[PDB]
A paper describes a structure:
To understand the molecular basis of PEP recognition by Mtb-FbiD, we crystallized the protein and solved the structure by selenium single-wavelength anomalous diffraction (Se-SAD), and then used this selenomethionine-substituted structure to obtain the native FbiD structure by molecular replacement. The latter was then refined at 1.99 Å resolution (R/Rfree = 0.19/0.22). As expected, Mtb-FbiD adopts the same MobA-like nucleoside triphosphate transferase family protein fold as CofC: a central 7-stranded β-sheet (six parallel strands and one antiparallel), with α-helices packed on either side. FbiD has a cone-shaped binding cleft with a groove running across the base of the cone, formed by the C-terminal end of the central β-sheet. Moreover, we did not observe GTP binding in either our co-crystallization or differential scanning fluorimetry experiments. We speculate that the GTP binding site is not formed until FbiD/CofC interacts with FbiA/CofD, enabling catalysis to proceed through to formation of dehydro-F420-0.
Author numbering: 7 to 211
The structure:
């Protein structure tokens, strides 16, 4: 059995992926965000090195979906006026997950084209470092952050790749297109769909 505690943080679905609003009705946009989480979780759950998957979210629909796939779920109590709610949530989940795992991996929940093998390989590569990350497709963001026997020090948000790099996290290379293809914009979604999205995202779009 595995040694990696995987964390995914998910914001309120109404707030999520607002740059997809031009191509989706609000209910369809929320459905796409949830479906991308489902496909990401499904791909991740195939990775043999995982001990657990923990989803932290204030969104009860996302909570139900994750729990319904056999993930651990943490309610996110982070106030609305917290200046950095994403990293606050990750750090909160980390404190819990750290009780049961020494090696923790934070994964974006909007990777609908993720293949199990891609994540497995990324984690194998990460084992050679204390802290490491995979940049997303366009290079400014972070698809995955990995910490082996040390604190994550997450710097997700704008310009996270650069911030992670500055923090001393080593950048992993490895094509892993499905791992890198996070979906923020319609262009990102087009790219993901060309790689091949999982069935939940296929249905939602």
């Amino acid at each position: 059995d595995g040694d990696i505690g995987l964390i995914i943080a998910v914001k309120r679905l109404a707030a999520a992926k607002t740059r997809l609003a031009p191509v989706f009705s609000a209910q369809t946009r929320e459905n796409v965000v949830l479906a991308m989480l489902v496909d990401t979780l499904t791909a991740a759950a195939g990775v043999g090195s995982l001990r657990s998957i923990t989803v932290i979210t204030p969104d009860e629909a996302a909570a139900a979906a994750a729990a319904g796939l056999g993930a651990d779920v943490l309610a996110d109590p982070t106030p609305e006026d917290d200046p950095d709610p994403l990293n606050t949530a990750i750090t909160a989940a980390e404190r819990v997950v750290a009780e049961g795992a020494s090696n923790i991996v934070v994964l974006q929940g909007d990777l609908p084209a993720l293949q199990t093998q891609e994540l497995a390989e990324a984690i194998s590569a990460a084992r050679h470092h204390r802290r490491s990350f995979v940049a997303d497709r366009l290079g400014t963001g972070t698809a995955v952050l990995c910490a082996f026997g040390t604190a994550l020090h997450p710097r997700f948000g704008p310009d996270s790749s650069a911030r992670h790099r500055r923090s001393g996290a080593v950048e992993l290379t490895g094509a892993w297109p499905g791992l890198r293809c996070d979906v923020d914009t319609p262009a990102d979604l087009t790219a993901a769909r060309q790689l091949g999205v999982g069935p939940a995202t296929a249905r939602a779009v």
